[PDB]
Every structure is written in C-alpha cells, then in structure tokens.
Write a protein that binds this ligand. Structure first.
Ligand SMILES: *[C@@H]1O[C@H](CO)[C@@H](O[C@@H]2O[C@H](CO)[C@@H](O)[C@H](O)[C@H]2NC(C)=O)[C@H](O[C@@H]2O[C@@H](C)[C@@H](O)[C@@H](O)[C@@H]2O)[C@H]1NC(C)=O
Ligand SMILES: *[C@@H]1O[C@H](CO)[C@@H](O[C@@H]2O[C@H](CO)[C@@H](O)[C@H](O)[C@H]2NC(C)=O)[C@H](O[C@@H]2O[C@@H](C)[C@@H](O)[C@@H](O)[C@@H]2O)[C@H]1NC(C)=O
Ligand SMILES: [Ca+2]
Ligand SMILES: [Ca+2]
Ligand SMILES: [Mn+2]
Ligand SMILES: [Mn+2]
Lengths: 243, 243
C-alpha cells in the first residue's frame, strides 16, 4: 500500500535494532523510554555542539506523477529538558529525501549545512521547528518560536513560543497535519494546563519534496538542553486525491 | 481581556444553571456526563426530527477594526451514538453571531432555515460539520463526510468520513484550529485505534463573521442517532496580530 500508520504510545521497549523501525543518526540515541536527539554526559547532562536525528526507517510515500498525494497527521510528545534559560538550539519535525542525513549542529538543527542554509535551491526539506534561540543571521524573530521551514532555515512563517514554555521543561504534545488537497500544513502545540500554539501555512509538498521521503526528528545544540521524544504516532491517507 | 481559555475534561458536574457557563437551546440538554444535543425518549433512544444547540455563554472575541484577530484552538470528544446504519443527520461545531439561535432540524443541523440554507448572503455562520447523511439537495458528496461550511450548508470543502467511523458509535476526538494570520481553518478527527481525518481550508473569519461570536455545538436529526459531547476545551490567542 501507499499509506503509513504507526503508533508508539511510549518508547519503554528500547530494545529494537537501529534501522529496523527507527534509524538513529549522529548523536541521537535510543534510551529506555525515549528517543534522545543530542548528546549527554554520564549524568543525562547535555553536551554542547551536537546534532542527531531519529527517523522512521521505511520510506514514506508523498505523491506520484499520477496526482495521488498523501495527506498526513503526526502527533508526538516530547520533553525539551532545559538547564537554565535561555538554552540553544531546539528541535524539528522534518520530511527530507530518503538518502539524506544529519547535518550541522547548533542553529541549523541537524538539518542544514552552514554554507547553503539560506539558499532554497540547495535544499529539499520541509520542517516544523521549535527554535529556542534567536539567530539574527537567519532572521529568527526576537523570541523562541515555532516555525515552518521550506528548503531553508529562514522560516516562511513563525509564531511566538513563550519563554516559560520554551525553557520550562514540561512535556508538550504536538500535532502536525498536512492536507494534500488544499496544500496546508498546520502545527498545534499544547501544554497540559497551559496554552496552545497554532501555526498554519500553505505549502505544496509535491512541489518541494520528492515522491517518497524519510520522516523524523532532528535536533541541534547549542547548550544546556536536550530533547527527548516520548511517543510518536503517524498516519497518512490518499483520500480525496482520486485514490 | 480579549481572549478565552476553558477546559471541561468531562461533564460529570451536570449541576450548573442553564446559561451560566453553557447555554442549551432547542432540544439540547445537560445530562450527567454529557451535553446531549437532540432529543431522546425515556430509554436514551433517539427521537426523530429534533434540533439542539449547546454553546458557550460568554461572547468570544474574534477580531476588531484595529486589526487584532484571534487565533484559536478547540478540542472535544464526542459520542455520536447510532441505532443502525445509516443514520441522520450529524452534528457541527460552529461560530455564529451572539444573538442567533437554533434553526431547522434534519440536514440543516440546527444551523440553517430551509428557505435560505443555500444562500451565503442570508447567513453568517462558520461551521465544521460531521454529516452522516447524503442530502443531494445541498450537494453533499456521496458518503458521510466532514465539511467546512461558510454561510451555507453547501460545504466549501469536504473529506470522506468512513461508514464504520460515521456509524460505528465509538468516542471520537476532534481538534479544530484557526490561524488568524494565515486565515486557515484545520479539522483533525481521531479514533483511538483507528484512522485520522484531516481537512483544512483557507477561510478569513473577519470577512464572514462579526467581531464577537457565540461558539458551540449544533445537531439536527433525522433518525436513529443522538450526539453526546463528553469534554470540551477552547483556547484563543491574539498572537502575531500586533497584540
Ligand atoms: C544506525 O544506522 C545507520 C545506517 O542506516 C547508521 O548511519 C550510518 O552510519 C555510518 C557509520 O557507522 C555512516 O557511514 C553512514 O553514512 C550512516 N548513514 C547515514 C544515513 O548517515 C547510524 O550511524 C550513526 O549515524 C551516522 C551518520 C554517524 O553519525 C554514526 O556515528 C552514528 O553511529 C546507526 N546508528 C548507530 C550506530 O547508532
Ligand atoms: C437556556 O437559556 C436560554 C436563554 O439564554 C433559553 O433560550 C430561550 O428560551 C426562551 C423560551 O424559554 C426563548 O423565548 C428564547 O428565544 C430562547 N433563547 C434563544 C437564544 O433562542 C433556553 O431555552 C431553550 O431554547 C429555546 C430556543 C427553546 O427551544 C426552549 O424550548 C428551550 O428550553 C434555556 N434552556 C432550557 C430551559 O433548557
Ligand atoms: Ca535559531
Ligand atoms: Ca447531509
Ligand atoms: Mn528559527
Ligand atoms: Mn454535508
């Protein structure tokens, strides 16, 4: 079939072989209960200048020449543990070509290399970033933000992420949806007894990504932080695109 | 303040006075544990030709002349109990003027009157419908569907809702988000060990609705069905619209 549907309610079954279900790249490791994205020393304390990626092993069908295009929805809970405020650099949910890998650390979030990050013609990646650091270089807005990145680290759209959420170290739940008929990407971020964050933008994936992609989480530090992914669900559907 | 934030995890505190927190119109009633939208006989069994609305009592600020516009997110779980398959007519989450009320039953979902339902100039309502009945009259697609209605019962966009979900009588969770900067409305519907449904569409609320609205649930039957709302959360934010 052309669609995907998986659900990991938690990651307490930390025993599967790298590359069978989830592939860990760079400094991303599987620990009991979580996908850890960047490096920590013996005490779980975050190491500076590190990048890692945890991505689903099977290729994910996005679109085909015949007009079939997948709509999708992914939800995940994560803990961006902070060791002070502010911290750097954040994490990202992404869709990239199957052959790609982790790139630069820090503000590039393991997704871009320094020399081509602001060039949309040299990159093929769509990402939803949870950026804890204002890099003026890449035109980050003057606060922690959530952003939608299309082929570049300069977001096509961002919304404010409050300091206390961004550096508060609480578990957060994210829902990211893509409607393939209207070409809309929506991000919803919720904190249990807190506020929600909404960011939606029109982006046609068929025009920016190959027909089949790898999906996953990418992180880049920075300092005083480490992101843990606690659960992951993904569902894609061809509904409404003639199949 | 101009924003709203409430959370009802369940409705087991069925004792609040009508109109203080939630207002019940028509045949919608408050029962232990749920907001019941249409009528049932002594045994909880659904009565035909009924309409009811359960809406939040305070007015909800949407936009103002000065450009401030509210982004929002609402989540709710509901049980559309079915007494066979197919059943009629569904339910809807809506945003309408503060002075409005419940309208016709059946395929109008308590939201429109028969004579002006297909006329966008005579209505001011934005609704997300979960339609269990194909009314060829109103150009419903040939299946249960989820639809986005703007000033008319003829949806500006729909996506397929599978028969087994539509008439399966399981609790479903819906997330509806509106981003006021990009004018995008997204609907996410999830079933626990099932599939998800994604429908997003560009709709500028400031151009179709008054500055302050009432929000709620509306239902219209039909036959062999009754909708129960089990929980409700709403959050609105002025973020990114200069306030
Ligand atoms: C998990 O499996 C991956 C293969 O699907 C490993 O990545 C590959 O590692 C090779 C070195 O062991 C490297 O030459 C390959 O290019 C790389 N594959 C990709 C797509 O980059 C992965 O190894 C980790 O990731 C690479 C990129 C390095 O940073 C290694 O240090 C990492 O170990 C495997 N994970 C492991 C061993 O944890
Ligand atoms: C809950 O409070 C409402 C007032 O905020 C009631 O609605 C009002 O009911 C009047 C008749 O009792 C009617 O003249 C008003 O127009 C109506 N308000 C609106 C906005 O329509 C409501 O009454 C229910 O809803 C109305 C529309 C009728 O269908 C009544 O039969 C219902 O009782 C109150 N709910 C109750 C008493 O359950
Ligand atoms: Ca940054
Ligand atoms: Ca209908
Ligand atoms: Mn950024
Ligand atoms: Mn319909």
């Amino acid at each position: 079939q052309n669609t995907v549907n998986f659900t990991y309610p938690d990651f307490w079954s930390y025993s599967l072989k790298n590359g069978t279900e989830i592939t860990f790249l760079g400094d991303a490791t599987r620990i009991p209960g979580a996908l850890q994205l960047t490096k920590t020393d013996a005490n779980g304390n975050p190491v500076r200048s590190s990048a890692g990626q945890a991505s689903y092993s099977e290729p994910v069908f996005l679109w085909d020449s015949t007009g079939k295009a997948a709509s999708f929805y992914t939800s995940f809970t994560f803990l961006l543990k902070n060791y002070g405020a502010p911290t750097a650099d954040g994490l990202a949910f992404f869709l990239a070509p199957v052959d790609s890998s982790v790139k630069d650390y820090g503000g590039f979030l393991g997704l871009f290399r320094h020399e081509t990050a602001a060039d949309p013609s040299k990159n093929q990646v769509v990402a939803v970033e949870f950026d804890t650091w204002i890099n003026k270089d890449w035109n980050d807005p003057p606060y922690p933000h959530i952003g939608i990145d299309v082929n570049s680290i300069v977001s096509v759209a961002t919304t404010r992420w409050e300091n206390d959420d961004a550096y508060g170290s609480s578990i957060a739940t994210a829902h990211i949806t893509y409607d393939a008929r209207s070409k809309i990407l929506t991000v919803l971020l919720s904190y249990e007894h807190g506020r929600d964050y909404i960011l939606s933008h029109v982006v046609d994936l068929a025009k920016v990504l190959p027909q089949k992609v790898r999906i996953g989480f990418s992180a880049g530090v920075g300092y005083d932080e480490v992101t843990y992914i606690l659960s992951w669900h993904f569902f894609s559907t061809l509904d409404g695109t003639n199949k």
